[PDB]
Amino acid sequence: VNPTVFFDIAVDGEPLGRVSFELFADKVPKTAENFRALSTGEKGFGYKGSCFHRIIPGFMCQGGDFTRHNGTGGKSIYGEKFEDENFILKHTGPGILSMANAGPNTNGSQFFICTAKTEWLDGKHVVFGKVKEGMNIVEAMERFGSRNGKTSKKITIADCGQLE
């Protein structure tokens, strides 16, 4: 019942591979629906063509700023930043999908993929999904990050949508 979405990732325009995610709509339905909709584009805006702008090896890949492409933008499907739905799910290791924010109850469209266990984020970021296939593609993306998060090649979401 939980939706599955895919990203097709490119590096300086050259295809790299596909990552798929299970979205935990059973436990965080508003946050999963926001990500699902942005991935299909069905509201007229979303993740297709956006970049991963902040990559820190051993930590996480962050993306979803499809408005300003640098971490200062993005918007939810709700016409406003929305609340932290709950913190039932924890940051337990690589592959966790979690919302980036600007403090309590400021969720928009930016998200990150953990590449390690990041327990210090528990209770601060809403976990809402996990990598299902293609963790190796996230690992390949990680290698184009750096200590301060700057990417050495442009990492894009060349296509995205809903699977199954």
Curated annotation (Swiss-Prot):
The modification N-acetylvaline is found at residue 1. The gene is PPIA. This is Peptidyl-prolyl cis-trans isomerase A. There is a cross-link at residue 27 (Glycyl lysine isopeptide (Lys-Gly) (interchain with G-Cter in ubiquitin)). Interacts with protein phosphatase PPP3CA/calcineurin A. Interacts with PRPF19 isoform 2 (via N-terminus). Interacts with isoform 2 of BSG/CD147. Interacts with FOXO1; the interaction promotes FOXO1 dephosphorylation, nuclear accumulation and transcriptional activity. Interacts with integrin ITGA2B:ITGB3; the interaction is ROS and peptidyl-prolyl cis-trans isomerase (PPIase) activity-dependent and is increased in the presence of thrombin. Interacts with MAP3K5. Catalyzes the cis-trans isomerization of proline imidic peptide bonds in oligopeptides. Exerts a strong chemotactic effect on leukocytes partly through activation of one of its membrane receptors BSG/CD147, initiating a signaling cascade that culminates in MAPK/ERK activation. Activates endothelial cells (ECs) in a pro-inflammatory manner by stimulating activation of NF-kappa-B and ERK, JNK and p38 MAP-kinases and by inducing expression of adhesion molecules including SELE and VCAM1. (Microbial infection) May act as a mediator between human SARS coronavirus nucleoprotein and BSG/CD147 in the process of invasion of host cells by the virus. It catalyses: [protein]-peptidylproline (omega=180) = [protein]-peptidylproline (omega=0). Acetylation at Lys-124 markedly inhibits catalysis of cis to trans isomerization and stabilizes cis rather than trans forms of the HIV-1 capsid. PPIA acetylation also antagonizes the immunosuppressive effects of cyclosporine by inhibiting the sequential steps of cyclosporine binding and calcineurin inhibition. Acetylation at Lys-124 favors its interaction with TARDBP.
